[PDB]
């Protein structure tokens, strides 16, 4: 996963090197989230840039929302097996 690698790299930079990520670093992360279609990570990064940095590139925020609404139309908002109704004795504990 590209997102995991970059986040770990940022963790190393801020914690084990004492360097504050700038706007450029977060923009790269947001671009990766948009490119990969992971629209839920984009929301979290969007708030991070709106909190630490000054806002988010509005181009990327709109792109993420478009991906999210595509999932709603296609129904891939959450993994389906989660939506399946279960019960006390209807759950398979591997």
Partner 1 sequence: RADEVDYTNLPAPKPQKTVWDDNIETEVLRKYLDGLSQYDMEEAKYGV
Partner 2 sequence: ISGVSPLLYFPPTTTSTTNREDQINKNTNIAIQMIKRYKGEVPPHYTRKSSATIEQVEKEIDALLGGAEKLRKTSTDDQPMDKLTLMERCLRHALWSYHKEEGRYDFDQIGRWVVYTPEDEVKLAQLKREVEAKEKLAALRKRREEEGLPGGPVPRINWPQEYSSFIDREPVVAKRIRYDTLASTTLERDEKQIES
Burial (CB count <10 Å: 0-12, 13-18, 19+), residue 30: buried
Q: Binding partner of residue 85 among partner 1, partner 2, none, CB under 5 to 8 Å per kind?
A: partner 2
Interface with partner 1, residue 84, by CB under 8 A:
yes
Q: Please give the Cα distance from 11 to 6 (Å, whole number).
A: 9
Q: Please give the Cα distance from 49 to 68 (Å, whole number).
A: 19
Query: Closer CB to partner 1, residue 24 or residue 74?
Result: 74
- How near is the Cβ of 56 to partner 2 at its closest, in Å? 31
Concatenating the DSSP letter of every residue in 6-34 gives: HHHHHHHHHHSS-----HHHHHHHHHHHH
Interface with partner 2, residue 75, by CB under 8 A:
yes
Q: Which of residues 1, 17, 51, 85 is near partner 2 by CB under 8 A?
A: 85
Interface with partner 2, residue 74, by CB under 8 A:
yes
Residues contributing to the site for partner 2 (CB under 8 A): 74-75, 83, 85
């Amino acid at each position: 996963s590209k997102f995991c690698a970059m986040m770990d790299l940022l963790e190393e930079m801020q914690h084990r090197n004492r360097l504050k990520p700038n706007e450029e670093s977060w923009t790269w992360v947001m671009k990766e989230c948009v490119k990969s279609g992971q629209f839920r990570l984009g929301y979290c990064i969007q708030q991070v840039m709106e909190t630490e940095c000054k806002g988010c590139p509005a181009d990327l925020v709109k792109a993420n929302e478009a991906n999210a609404q595509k999932a709603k139309t296609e129904g891939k908002e959450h993994p389906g097996h989660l939506s399946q109704q279960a019960g006390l004795f209807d759950v398979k504990v591997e």
